[PDB]
Amino acid sequence: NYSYIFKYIIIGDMGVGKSCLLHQFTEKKFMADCPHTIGVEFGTRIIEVSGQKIKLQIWDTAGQERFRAVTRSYYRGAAGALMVYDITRRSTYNHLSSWLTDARNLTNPNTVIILIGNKADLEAQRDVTYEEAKQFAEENGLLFLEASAKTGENVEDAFLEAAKKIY
Ligand SMILES: Nc1nc2c(ncn2[C@@H]2O[C@H](COP(=O)(O)OP(=O)(O)O)[C@@H](O)[C@H]2O)c(=O)[nH]1
Numbered sequence: 001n002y003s004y005i006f007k008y009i010i011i012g013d014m015g016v017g018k019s020c021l022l023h024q025f026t027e028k029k030f031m032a033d034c035p036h037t038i039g040v041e042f043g044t045r046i047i048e049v050s051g052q053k054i055k056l057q058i059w060d061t062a063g064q065e066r067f068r069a070v071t072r073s074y075y076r077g078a079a080g081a082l083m084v085y086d087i088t089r090r091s092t093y094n095h096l097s098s099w100l101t102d103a104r105n106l107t108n109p110n111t112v113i114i115l116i117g118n119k120a121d122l123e124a125q126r127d128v129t130y131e132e133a134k135q136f137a138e139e140n141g142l143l144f145l146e147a148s149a150k151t152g153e154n155v156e157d158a159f160l161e162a163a164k165k166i167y
């Protein structure tokens, strides 16, 4: 049961963990025994926000908004956007202005955007600081969390904090 529907997109460079973040949230598990599959594209989950029951739809959109009319309008009705980079890979951080442009250009003026730095579990291999990403987020009025799709650290919060701001 639910009283509202929130559409989410999840975007960012290939291999940053978009499919894993979506899977960890909807199914509460990290695979590790299934490296041979493509990686989950879509999912849903009912959450409780501010005393309300809300259904979240989540789409690893993969740039299909340029080709598919239905993907085009889902994008235009997006309530939230997770913009994801890989903390161990600076190039994924460097492409954020491009992803932010797409996001804003192709959604609607209400769309709430959250920045996620994924793979926080790989501490020894950190390539991007918390501090620089926090300043990018603050400049652009985004929410910001460092998270780990593998361990589940801050993954629930990622989706829930966005939803509470959507009100
Ligand atoms: N260590 C670690 N590996 C991850 C994490 N999230 C994803 N991966 C791995 O990164 C690779 C790409 O993940 P995937 O979700 O398919 O990336 P996508 O292309 O953005 O959807 C896979 O081999 C995952 O097992 C994480 O939080 N920590």
Ligand SMILES: [Mg+2]
Binding pocket: 018, 019, 038, 039, 040, 060
């Ligand atoms: Mg994927």
